[PDB]
């Protein structure tokens, strides 16, 4: 079987998106710098400690999905200095969604979360994204350009021992899912700062941690159309916060109105003609 | 030719979106009553004369594709109080989205929008609306449900002289789009209160304005499944507003989380697996 391909962020920028549209995955070595991993990590530490159970009782919003020992951290510009700074101005991310959105036009953030896997985290059944969200994706035409896709960014080792990655490459273009098995899928074996780049319709799934020692930590980022709702909300994030970003970060978090690809395009979240960002006064990059 | 089915809003409820499905259009009649015209005329009335052309100098989202003549006014919300109240707790517009969208969840409001054509207003071309703003749509298997439908509510006389909505009934349907003209079409005769409901996929136009003094009014409620963007905001809407509204009205304005049909649905703009309303402490039903 043939390995996930491994591109690098400095030199391969161009080969990336080309290569998960052909296979449908690609490893992107030091998507993050390790600075940036240590202050993600530090950052969050915290509110990861804090979250209870996916499916906990206090939430109307349970995921019933995620296995009990399983802790997902969304909302993260709060949270994170380095994520809404660093991760959401990421030069190589932009230029892969700018790569893969073109046909639909502006891209944002569906959901930035941290996961932690506990020890002995069972594996994932393998699966496609969105499925349990956006019911409109199963609708799409076979060979409507992905509207999603999906950055695993390694936040601590990810070895076959502690449960990285499962994919089966390919995948994306299945239509008839009968050959769906684990003796299909390749691993994403990445060190921290590493990404595993999946479209919205590669076949994956969470590795089984076996140690029942190691921590596993990862940063998806789900990237997506403007014109696809968001799984998460920043509309509680405080205006100083938001004020403290770029205006690219403030787009991605929903913060200003989005363009379609239409060649007389009437754009989203508009205001009688008139953007978010104009009509708010919203500023930008004006620190706290 | 077969005229565009009329049904009572009273007393046919059950049988509207079933008869939509079928034939691509109906009339509702008496949609809104006329004591609810009377008083979103009057509440609209001077930001339509205030309003500049559709591709203005001064927009930063200009709509190129309406005549110069016309005027739009969208986020009705901070202007009209028939709107945020009569309007969007229709139980003929929710009973109507809920036959139509129950297989992807949760829908809103991608546009409510008022339009105003001055005399002498040229046809449309025949199209299928969202094609300016969802590029994704066109994506979507033929057999797919419909993701948006658009109430178009007739605030004045629409006649076939003054320029009446031209709809082609089964079009919803069509694939080969070689016999669309408008020898094809029929006419939304209605008096004000009477809404045309029409699919993303109904081939229709504005008609021609024939008299050169008559001025038509119309209420466009675009509704769609809360997986899609609006092309409004109401972001900017003040918070007094939005907290006087009823729980399901914030939600239609995006000021709640959503849901999708997924069994076991993980939804739409939560906060850490908790809705926007519950995390912000959203008030309803609070007079201003
Ligand atoms: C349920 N669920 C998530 O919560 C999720 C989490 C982070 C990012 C994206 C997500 N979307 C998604 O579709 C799933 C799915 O994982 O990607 C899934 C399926 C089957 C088993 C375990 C997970
Ligand atoms: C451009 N445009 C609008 O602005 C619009 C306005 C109100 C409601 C929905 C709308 N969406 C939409 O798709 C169109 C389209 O009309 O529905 C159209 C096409 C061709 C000619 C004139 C209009
Ligand atoms: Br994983
Ligand atoms: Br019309
Ligand atoms: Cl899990
Ligand atoms: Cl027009
Ligand atoms: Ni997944
Ligand atoms: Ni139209």
Redesign the interface.
């Known amino acids: 079987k043939s390995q996930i391909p491994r591109l690098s962020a400095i030199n391969d920028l161009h080969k990336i998106w080309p290569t998960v549209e052909e296979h449908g995955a690609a490893i992107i070595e030091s998507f993050l710098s390790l600075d940036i991993v240590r202050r993600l990590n530090e950052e969050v530490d915290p509110f990861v400690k804090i979250?209870?159970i996916?499916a906990?009782k206090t939430?109307?919003?349970?995921?019933?999905?995620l296995s009990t020992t399983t802790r997902?951290?969304?909302?993260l510009a709060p949270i994170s200095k380095a994520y809404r700074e660093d991760v959401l101005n990421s030069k190589v991310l932009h230029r892969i969604c700018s790569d893969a959105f073109h046909?639909?036009?502006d891209y944002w953030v569906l959901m930035g979360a941290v996961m932690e896997l506990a020890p002995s985290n069972p594996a994932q059944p393998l699966h496609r994204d969105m499925?349990?969200?956006?019911?409109?994706v199963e609708?799409?035409?076979p060979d409507?350009?992905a509207?999603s896709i999906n950055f695993l960014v390694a936040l601590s080792p990810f070895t076959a021992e502690n449960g990285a990655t499962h994919v089966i490459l390919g995948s994306h273009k299945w239509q008839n899912l009968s050959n769906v098995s684990m003796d299909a899928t390749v691993r994403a074996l990445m060190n921290p700062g590493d990404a595993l780049l999946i479209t919205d319709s590669t076949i994956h799934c969470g590795g089984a941690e076996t140690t029942g020692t190691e921590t596993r930590r990862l940063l998806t980022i789900t990237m997506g159309?403007?014109?696809?709702?968001?799984?998460?909300?920043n509309?509680?994030v405080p205006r100083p916060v938001i004020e403290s970003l770029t205006p690219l970060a403030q787009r991605l978090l929903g913060?200003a109105?989005?363009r379609?690809?239409?060649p007389?395009?009437?754009?989203?979240?508009?205001?009688?003609?008139?953007?978010?960002e104009?009509?708010?006064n919203l500023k930008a990059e004006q620190p706290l």
């Open positions: 979250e209870p996916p906990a939430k109307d919003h349970p995921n019933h999905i997902l951290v969304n909302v046909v639909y036009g499925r349990f969200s956006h019911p409109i609708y799409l035409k409507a350009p509207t159309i403007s014109q696809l709702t968001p799984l998460e909300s509309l509680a913060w109105s989005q379609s690809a239409a007389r395009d009437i754009g989203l979240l508009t205001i009688r003609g008139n953007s978010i104009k009509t708010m």
